[PDB]
Amino acid sequence: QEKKERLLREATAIKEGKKKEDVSKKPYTVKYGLNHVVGLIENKKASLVLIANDVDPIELVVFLPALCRKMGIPYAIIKGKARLGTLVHKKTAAVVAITEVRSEDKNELAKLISAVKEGYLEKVEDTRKRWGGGIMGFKAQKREEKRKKSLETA
Amino acid sequence: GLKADEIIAQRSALPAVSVRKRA
Amino acid sequence: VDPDQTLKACKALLAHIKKAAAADEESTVAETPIWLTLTTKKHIHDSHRLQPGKIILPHPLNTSEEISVCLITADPQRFYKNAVADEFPEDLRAKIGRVIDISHLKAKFKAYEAQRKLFSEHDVFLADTRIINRLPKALGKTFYKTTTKRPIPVVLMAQREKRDPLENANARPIPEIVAEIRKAIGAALVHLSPSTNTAIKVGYANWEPEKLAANIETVIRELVERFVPQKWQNVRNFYVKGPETAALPIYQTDELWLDESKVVP
Amino acid sequence: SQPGVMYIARLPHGFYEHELRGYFSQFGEITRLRVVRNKKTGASRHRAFIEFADAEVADIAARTMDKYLLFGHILTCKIVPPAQVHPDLFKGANRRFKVVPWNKMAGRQLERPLSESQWQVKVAKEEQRRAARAEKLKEMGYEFEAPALKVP
Amino acid sequence: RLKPEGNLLKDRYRSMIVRGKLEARRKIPFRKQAKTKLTEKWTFKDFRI
Amino acid sequence: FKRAEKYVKEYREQEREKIRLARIAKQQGAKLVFVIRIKGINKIPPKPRKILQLLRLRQINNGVFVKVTKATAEMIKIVEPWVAYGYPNLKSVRELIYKRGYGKVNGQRIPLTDNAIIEENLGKYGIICIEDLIHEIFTVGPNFKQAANFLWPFKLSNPNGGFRPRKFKHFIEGGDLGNREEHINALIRAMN
Amino acid sequence: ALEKKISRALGRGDVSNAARLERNANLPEKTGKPRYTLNHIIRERYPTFQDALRDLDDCLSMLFLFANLPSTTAVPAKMIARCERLCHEFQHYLIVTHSLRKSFLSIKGIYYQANIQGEDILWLVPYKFNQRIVGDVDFRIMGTFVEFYMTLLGFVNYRLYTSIGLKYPPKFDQVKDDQGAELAAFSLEGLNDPSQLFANFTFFLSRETPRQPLEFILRAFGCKRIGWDAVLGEGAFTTDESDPRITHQIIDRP
Amino acid sequence: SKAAKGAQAKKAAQAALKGVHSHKKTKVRKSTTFHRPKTLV
RNA sequence: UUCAACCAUCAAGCCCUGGGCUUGUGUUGGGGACCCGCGGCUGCUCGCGGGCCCUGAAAAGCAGUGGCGGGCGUGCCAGCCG
């Protein structure tokens, strides 16, 4: 509906003989779409990248933290591709990016970037290099505990 | 300039990668 | 207060400033403010008044073309921006470097570094009286820890539900706005704080000593008449000094008490 | 067993003694707490020290609230070692820091009547103040005839 | 000073039942709840600090 | 568990309310108004809490009639962030008293199902019927205080409770402080 | 399904989409009408206008009862106002056609008997007091009856007004309604003997007298000038009691 | 006890870092047989 | 388990016809030189208030003064005064 209203205003501007840039202002939106966001990261235009934690197939985003580290882009893994879809008016978004905001939100964006850098990236710097999984089931853990206490007693 | 703008625009030293020349 | 002692002080202060700067030379002598210092027996005010009072001078201040003036108005800013761009004289158009309303000010200058950047980008700040009570919270201690660049009150309201800014601006005519802005830019500022001291910028070192004498004398009459409680019975001392010079007394009292009630046996 | 001392900084405005005690009492028992404040104005200096009864509780709370983004502030929460904790760190803790109006005291004391002997002290003092100012104005090249103060 | 008697809403309801457009039923203030078991989420179980 | 942001928000709300009350008390400075208790700040300072106790607005969606004097205007100015008030019209007063009118006799709540209760309890003041009560309330007579203390506070409803997606939503949103004048009647129609 | 879509929109945070979808719900709390349209049901249940007139006893008793009830979730306040509006329109038709025949003040309420097109219509109206809703009745299914009965009464009123050649719905003044006009807020306009018992009199109703039944009965039996106290509402012929033109006064004070 | 104090600290940390909706409602099933639910036709 | 917005986007009062005046109290914390005014301090100095710079809404003991009421003389007040 907002796009229809904007196009109506631009049509009236063309009818009265003005450019559409004279009636419309430069937009600031959250950038989305996986190919678009990857292109923005490669062009180093993205200021912040949020990547969904539940992308299937996982190969669509498995390179993206390393890409952000190579390009020096602040990234964060976030819960909910549906949650990002609520931002971008979709059912699902695999990744979203902020490139630039308005002047009244530049401070908030900088504070969010610093908060991400100090509270997520420095904490996951050492844990991201480890292997996951390897957990045993409940009965297997109990059997192993009984075995090790039996060996310690004997 | 502003420290907020510096924080937003801070990147690494690795040069940008482009698929093609753009208008 | 005899005028000859003050005008003699004018030559003495200007000569001392010039010979101290001699130890660009002209640029060092210039842009050096002259401060008139009020010393009272009591506190001049019971609380910190954050709106400066205006004293009109025969020789106005901020007359240099390099002075940048930021004007803060009520919503909308577009009407006042169009007024500056179209129906203002060219000298005021060159002098006014920024027009911003209170809503955009609260949106884009909430940050302390943003307030400091706005502080450094301009010299004289004028503020509409409809919004000047909200400016201490919007500008913080950046604009109000120092009394130099506090927003000077101007009247832009048309003298007589929620007003819609787009539909109506509720503004006085543009020549009246021009006269008010010129008067407020040229006026000198007095700041009321719970103190025995009050410093007023009356002129610069490159001015002529007679213009200093006239400006100091009219500041004396208007300040003791309007802003000093208990008139001259509160007045203790008047000094003239520069940023780095000593204080030259131009009036020293004979009684150190407000009245006979302070003297008790 | 061993008590724990946590230093917390980047405090947003409003996050003061009672708020800190109520928030970290959820984590564990707080024995002492002090927010560093300016004595001239009573305003907080955005830092505080919290002394928990239990060191492991203090450590858990510090790792929980380290780098916490609160009202535009990224909180700092560190555990100070028992070797580097100061013996007088919590002097004046667990009580209000009053806002004393020194400026209003000054106004009132210049509003007080004084007797004639200490008025003689004051006036005499201010004539040597005038004399020192005059002998400084000798090098100034400026002459001011200061009128004689009449004696009460 | 007239004191009205009866209740006209009750009268209309009784007229509905007596004329037989609906049958007389009683109010059920509490309905039986589904038998469920409370358990902790896996993320909150696997939380470690 | 309570959040640190909730602690900071509560402190800032209390500080702002303290500043507002101090400004009102420093500044200092006969119609009929209808006052409805709405949701505001959870923590109430003792003076607005005492004023709400006097006006019997302890529960949300309670409505009372207030005669505008200097003291009553001062109290309403004190408790604006927790109330919505305006000028009720004749239809609003009549519908409130006839549909949700309850009388306080022996400290208990009994509806006005007859003129007998009004005659037995306000007959010494010349009020012998519900229409006499409405006349006293609407014209603000000499016995308006006795009529208003006889009238129980009105328990208004929440129309949002009739719609399942917005079942938990409060009907009146806080923020529009001040007198609503004749626009309190839309709220009276919706909630009565 | 529409409610599920509204829940999805509110859960995703699309407030404009939620409002736009809620505009398609046709809620009784917003429209004053039943949620579902029963116009096709009315013709099926009443094959003839005579059958409608014969069920008008139950219809009028139910609607005149519910016009004085507080707002509930089952029966919202706007739908109660629509009940009152339909009852006032029916009363205005009875006044202009002089179809009202008998009235009776019992201990339960006021019985009215009218004659519309040869059919005797008898219904009971409560006295204007606070009405008690007890737990021994099924109030929600009573509200369903109310929805059906207002759907019937709208068509009955339309047919009666069109038969006597008047515009339906009548002109209604909201300012007079908020000032309390009640029956006096309606202006009946044309399209495109016991009836004159009170024709020559001027009546004044006092404060303690039942204004709506007295006004209805007097205007149906030929009174053209009824004044009353100012608190009783807008639309009085004369507010001042001391007017010399008034012939009769109704008082009930000791 | 020290274990109780530690458990309180862990619960406070969990509430601060994840929230308070730590539990889920699970159906009680008297039978081991699962039936296809009856849907609208 | 909601980190939103919400002061006066002008009112009231004087002059009595000029568009002017008065009130409506509302400021993050630190650091560095340095010219001062006034109070104490024998004095140094310490306070109160000004002047010139620097800063991500930055931070690592140094806390300092007389009381009314309230709570259990008091390292107690989501209560105030001086």
Coordinates of N, CA and C in Angstrom, one line a residue, chain A residues 5-141:
Chain A
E5 N 1.0 4.2 -2.8 CA 0.8 5.6 -2.5 C 2.0 6.4 -3.1
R6 N 3.2 5.9 -2.9 CA 4.4 6.6 -3.4 C 4.4 6.7 -5.0
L7 N 3.9 5.6 -5.6 CA 3.8 5.6 -7.1 C 2.8 6.6 -7.5
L8 N 1.7 6.7 -6.8 CA 0.6 7.7 -7.1 C 1.2 9.1 -7.0
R9 N 1.9 9.4 -5.9 CA 2.6 10.7 -5.8 C 3.6 11.0 -6.9
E10 N 4.4 10.0 -7.2 CA 5.3 10.2 -8.3 C 4.6 10.4 -9.7
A11 N 3.5 9.7 -9.9 CA 2.7 9.9 -11.1 C 2.1 11.3 -11.2
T12 N 1.7 11.9 -10.0 CA 1.2 13.2 -10.0 C 2.4 14.2 -10.3
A13 N 3.5 13.9 -9.7 CA 4.7 14.8 -10.0 C 5.1 14.8 -11.5
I14 N 5.1 13.6 -12.1 CA 5.3 13.6 -13.6 C 4.2 14.3 -14.3
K15 N 3.0 14.2 -13.9 CA 1.9 14.9 -14.6 C 2.0 16.4 -14.5
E16 N 2.5 16.9 -13.3 CA 2.7 18.3 -13.1 C 4.0 18.8 -13.6
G17 N 4.8 17.8 -14.1 CA 6.1 18.2 -14.8 C 7.3 18.3 -13.8
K18 N 7.3 17.4 -12.8 CA 8.5 17.4 -11.9 C 9.1 16.0 -11.9
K19 N 10.4 15.9 -11.5 CA 11.0 14.7 -11.4 C 10.5 13.9 -10.2
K20 N 10.6 12.6 -10.2 CA 10.2 11.8 -9.1 C 11.1 11.9 -7.9
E21 N 12.3 12.3 -8.1 CA 13.2 12.6 -7.0 C 12.8 13.9 -6.3
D22 N 12.1 14.8 -7.0 CA 11.6 16.0 -6.3 C 10.5 15.7 -5.3
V23 N 9.8 14.6 -5.4 CA 8.7 14.3 -4.5 C 9.1 13.1 -3.6
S24 N 10.0 12.2 -4.0 CA 10.4 11.1 -3.2 C 11.8 11.3 -2.6
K25 N 12.0 10.7 -1.4 CA 13.2 10.8 -0.6 C 13.9 9.5 -0.7
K26 N 15.3 9.6 -0.5 CA 16.1 8.4 -0.5 C 15.7 7.5 0.6
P27 N 15.5 6.2 0.3 CA 15.0 5.3 1.3 C 16.1 4.6 2.1
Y28 N 15.8 4.3 3.3 CA 16.7 3.5 4.2 C 15.9 2.3 4.7
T29 N 16.3 1.1 4.2 CA 15.6 -0.1 4.6 C 16.7 -1.2 5.0
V30 N 16.1 -2.2 5.6 CA 17.0 -3.4 5.9 C 17.2 -4.2 4.6
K31 N 18.4 -4.5 4.3 CA 18.7 -5.2 3.1 C 18.6 -6.7 3.3
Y32 N 18.1 -7.4 2.4 CA 17.8 -8.8 2.5 C 17.9 -9.5 1.2
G33 N 17.7 -10.8 1.2 CA 18.0 -11.7 0.0 C 19.5 -12.1 0.1
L34 N 19.7 -13.4 0.0 CA 21.0 -14.0 0.3 C 22.1 -13.5 -0.8
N35 N 21.7 -13.5 -2.0 CA 22.7 -13.1 -3.1 C 23.0 -11.6 -2.9
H36 N 22.0 -10.8 -2.7 CA 22.1 -9.4 -2.5 C 23.0 -9.0 -1.3
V37 N 22.8 -9.7 -0.2 CA 23.6 -9.5 1.0 C 25.0 -10.0 0.8
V38 N 25.2 -11.1 0.1 CA 26.6 -11.5 -0.2 C 27.3 -10.6 -1.1
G39 N 26.6 -10.0 -2.1 CA 27.2 -8.9 -2.9 C 27.6 -7.7 -2.1
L40 N 26.7 -7.3 -1.2 CA 27.0 -6.1 -0.3 C 28.2 -6.4 0.6
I41 N 28.3 -7.6 1.1 CA 29.5 -7.9 2.0 C 30.8 -7.9 1.1
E42 N 30.7 -8.5 -0.1 CA 31.9 -8.5 -1.0 C 32.3 -7.1 -1.4
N43 N 31.3 -6.2 -1.6 CA 31.6 -4.8 -1.9 C 31.8 -3.9 -0.6
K44 N 31.8 -4.6 0.6 CA 32.1 -4.0 1.9 C 31.2 -2.8 2.2
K45 N 29.9 -2.9 1.7 CA 28.9 -1.9 2.0 C 28.1 -2.2 3.2
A46 N 28.0 -3.4 3.6 CA 27.2 -3.8 4.8 C 27.9 -3.4 6.1
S47 N 27.1 -2.8 7.0 CA 27.6 -2.4 8.3 C 27.4 -3.5 9.4
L48 N 26.3 -4.2 9.2 CA 26.0 -5.3 10.2 C 25.3 -6.4 9.5
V49 N 25.6 -7.7 9.8 CA 25.0 -8.8 9.2 C 24.4 -9.7 10.2
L50 N 23.1 -10.1 10.1 CA 22.5 -11.0 11.0 C 22.1 -12.3 10.2
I51 N 22.6 -13.4 10.6 CA 22.4 -14.7 9.9 C 21.6 -15.6 10.7
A52 N 20.5 -16.2 10.1 CA 19.7 -17.1 10.8 C 20.4 -18.4 11.2
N53 N 20.1 -18.9 12.3 CA 20.8 -20.1 12.9 C 20.2 -21.4 12.3
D54 N 19.1 -21.4 11.6 CA 18.4 -22.7 11.2 C 18.2 -22.7 9.7
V55 N 19.2 -22.5 8.9 CA 19.1 -22.5 7.4 C 19.3 -23.9 7.0
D56 N 18.3 -24.5 6.2 CA 18.5 -25.8 5.6 C 18.2 -25.6 4.1
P57 N 19.2 -26.0 3.3 CA 20.6 -26.5 3.5 C 21.5 -25.5 4.2
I58 N 22.4 -26.1 5.0 CA 23.3 -25.2 5.8 C 24.4 -24.6 5.0
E59 N 24.7 -25.2 3.8 CA 25.7 -24.7 2.9 C 25.5 -23.3 2.4
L60 N 24.2 -22.8 2.5 CA 23.9 -21.5 2.0 C 24.5 -20.4 2.9
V61 N 24.8 -20.7 4.1 CA 25.3 -19.8 5.1 C 26.6 -20.2 5.8
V62 N 27.1 -21.4 5.4 CA 28.2 -22.0 6.2 C 29.5 -21.2 5.9
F63 N 29.6 -20.5 4.7 CA 30.8 -19.7 4.4 C 30.7 -18.3 4.9
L64 N 29.5 -17.9 5.3 CA 29.2 -16.5 5.5 C 29.9 -15.9 6.7
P65 N 30.0 -16.5 7.9 CA 30.9 -16.0 8.9 C 32.3 -15.8 8.5
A66 N 32.9 -16.7 7.7 CA 34.3 -16.6 7.2 C 34.4 -15.4 6.2
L67 N 33.4 -15.2 5.4 CA 33.3 -14.1 4.5 C 33.3 -12.8 5.2
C68 N 32.5 -12.7 6.3 CA 32.4 -11.5 7.1 C 33.7 -11.2 7.8
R69 N 34.4 -12.3 8.3 CA 35.7 -12.1 9.0 C 36.7 -11.6 8.0
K70 N 36.7 -12.2 6.7 CA 37.7 -11.7 5.7 C 37.4 -10.2 5.3
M71 N 36.2 -9.8 5.2 CA 35.9 -8.5 4.8 C 35.8 -7.5 6.0
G72 N 36.0 -8.0 7.2 CA 35.9 -7.1 8.4 C 34.5 -6.6 8.6
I73 N 33.5 -7.4 8.5 CA 32.1 -7.0 8.7 C 31.6 -7.6 10.0
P74 N 31.0 -6.8 10.8 CA 30.4 -7.3 12.1 C 29.2 -8.2 11.7
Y75 N 29.2 -9.4 12.2 CA 28.2 -10.4 11.9 C 27.7 -10.9 13.3
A76 N 26.5 -11.5 13.3 CA 25.9 -12.2 14.4 C 25.0 -13.2 13.9
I77 N 25.0 -14.4 14.6 CA 24.1 -15.5 14.3 C 22.9 -15.3 15.3
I78 N 21.7 -15.3 14.7 CA 20.5 -15.0 15.5 C 19.4 -16.1 15.3
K79 N 18.6 -16.3 16.3 CA 17.6 -17.3 16.3 C 16.4 -16.9 15.5
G80 N 16.0 -17.6 14.4 CA 14.8 -17.3 13.7 C 14.9 -16.8 12.3
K81 N 14.9 -17.7 11.3 CA 14.7 -17.2 10.0 C 13.3 -16.7 9.8
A82 N 12.3 -17.2 10.5 CA 11.0 -16.6 10.5 C 11.0 -15.3 11.2
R83 N 11.9 -15.1 12.2 CA 12.0 -13.9 12.9 C 12.6 -12.8 12.0
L84 N 13.5 -13.2 11.1 CA 14.0 -12.2 10.1 C 12.9 -12.0 9.0
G85 N 12.1 -13.0 8.7 CA 11.1 -12.8 7.8 C 10.0 -11.8 8.3
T86 N 9.8 -11.8 9.6 CA 8.9 -10.7 10.1 C 9.5 -9.3 9.9
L87 N 10.8 -9.2 9.9 CA 11.4 -7.9 9.5 C 11.1 -7.6 8.1
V88 N 11.3 -8.6 7.2 CA 11.3 -8.3 5.8 C 10.0 -8.6 5.1
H89 N 8.9 -8.7 5.9 CA 7.6 -9.0 5.4 C 7.5 -10.3 4.6
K90 N 8.2 -11.4 5.1 CA 8.3 -12.7 4.4 C 8.0 -13.7 5.5
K91 N 7.9 -15.0 5.0 CA 7.8 -16.1 5.9 C 9.2 -16.4 6.5
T92 N 10.2 -16.2 5.7 CA 11.5 -16.7 6.1 C 12.6 -15.8 5.4
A93 N 13.6 -15.4 6.1 CA 14.8 -14.7 5.6 C 16.0 -15.4 6.1
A94 N 16.9 -15.8 5.2 CA 18.1 -16.5 5.7 C 19.1 -15.6 6.3
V95 N 19.2 -14.3 5.8 CA 20.1 -13.3 6.3 C 19.6 -11.9 6.0
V96 N 19.9 -11.0 6.9 CA 19.6 -9.6 6.7 C 20.8 -8.8 7.0
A97 N 20.9 -7.6 6.4 CA 22.0 -6.7 6.5 C 21.6 -5.3 6.7
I98 N 22.3 -4.5 7.5 CA 22.2 -3.1 7.6 C 23.4 -2.5 6.9
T99 N 23.2 -1.6 5.9 CA 24.3 -0.9 5.3 C 24.4 0.5 5.8
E100 N 23.3 1.3 5.9 CA 23.3 2.6 6.4 C 21.9 2.9 7.0
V101 N 21.9 3.8 8.0 CA 20.7 4.2 8.6 C 20.5 5.7 8.6
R102 N 19.5 6.3 9.1 CA 19.3 7.7 9.2 C 20.2 8.3 10.3
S103 N 20.3 9.6 10.2 CA 21.2 10.3 11.1 C 20.8 10.3 12.6
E104 N 19.5 10.2 12.8 CA 19.0 10.0 14.2 C 19.2 8.6 14.7
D105 N 19.5 7.6 13.9 CA 19.8 6.3 14.3 C 21.2 5.8 14.1
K106 N 22.1 6.7 13.7 CA 23.5 6.4 13.5 C 24.2 6.0 14.8
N107 N 23.8 6.8 15.9 CA 24.4 6.5 17.2 C 23.9 5.1 17.7
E108 N 22.6 4.8 17.5 CA 22.1 3.5 17.9 C 22.7 2.4 17.1
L109 N 22.9 2.6 15.8 CA 23.6 1.6 15.0 C 25.0 1.3 15.4
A110 N 25.8 2.4 15.8 CA 27.1 2.3 16.2 C 27.2 1.6 17.6
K111 N 26.3 1.9 18.5 CA 26.2 1.3 19.8 C 25.9 -0.2 19.6
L112 N 25.0 -0.5 18.7 CA 24.6 -1.9 18.5 C 25.8 -2.7 17.9
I113 N 26.6 -2.1 17.0 CA 27.7 -2.7 16.4 C 28.8 -3.0 17.4
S114 N 29.0 -2.0 18.3 CA 30.0 -2.2 19.4 C 29.5 -3.2 20.4
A115 N 28.2 -3.3 20.7 CA 27.7 -4.3 21.6 C 27.8 -5.7 21.0
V116 N 27.6 -5.8 19.7 CA 27.8 -7.1 19.0 C 29.3 -7.5 19.1
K117 N 30.2 -6.6 18.8 CA 31.6 -6.9 18.8 C 32.1 -7.3 20.1
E118 N 31.7 -6.6 21.2 CA 32.2 -6.9 22.5 C 31.5 -8.0 23.2
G119 N 30.2 -8.3 22.9 CA 29.4 -9.3 23.6 C 29.1 -10.6 22.8
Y120 N 29.4 -10.7 21.5 CA 29.2 -11.9 20.8 C 30.5 -12.4 20.2
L121 N 31.2 -11.6 19.5 CA 32.3 -12.0 18.7 C 33.5 -12.4 19.5
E122 N 33.8 -11.6 20.5 CA 34.9 -11.9 21.4 C 34.6 -13.1 22.3
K123 N 33.3 -13.3 22.6 CA 33.0 -14.5 23.4 C 33.0 -15.8 22.5
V124 N 32.6 -15.7 21.2 CA 32.6 -16.9 20.4 C 33.9 -17.0 19.6
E125 N 34.9 -16.2 19.8 CA 36.2 -16.3 19.1 C 36.9 -17.6 19.3
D126 N 36.9 -18.1 20.5 CA 37.5 -19.4 20.8 C 36.6 -20.6 20.7
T127 N 35.3 -20.4 20.9 CA 34.4 -21.6 20.8 C 34.0 -21.9 19.4
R128 N 34.1 -21.0 18.4 CA 33.8 -21.3 17.1 C 34.8 -22.2 16.4
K129 N 36.0 -22.4 16.9 CA 37.0 -23.2 16.4 C 36.9 -24.7 16.9
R130 N 36.0 -25.0 17.8 CA 35.9 -26.3 18.3 C 34.8 -27.2 17.6
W131 N 34.9 -28.5 17.8 CA 34.0 -29.4 17.2 C 32.8 -29.5 18.1
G132 N 31.6 -29.7 17.5 CA 30.4 -29.9 18.1 C 30.0 -31.4 18.2
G133 N 28.9 -31.6 18.9 CA 28.3 -33.0 19.0 C 29.2 -33.8 20.0
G134 N 29.2 -35.1 19.7 CA 29.9 -36.1 20.6 C 29.3 -36.3 21.9
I135 N 28.0 -35.9 22.1 CA 27.3 -36.2 23.4 C 26.7 -37.6 23.4
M136 N 26.8 -38.2 24.6 CA 26.2 -39.6 24.7 C 24.8 -39.5 25.2
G137 N 24.1 -40.6 24.9 CA 22.7 -40.7 25.5 C 22.7 -40.9 27.0
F138 N 21.5 -40.9 27.5 CA 21.3 -40.9 29.0 C 21.8 -42.3 29.5
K139 N 21.4 -43.4 28.9 CA 21.7 -44.7 29.4 C 23.2 -45.0 29.2
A140 N 23.8 -44.4 28.1 CA 25.2 -44.6 27.8 C 26.0 -43.9 28.8
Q141 N 25.6 -42.6 29.2 CA 26.3 -41.9 30.2 C 26.2 -42.6 31.6

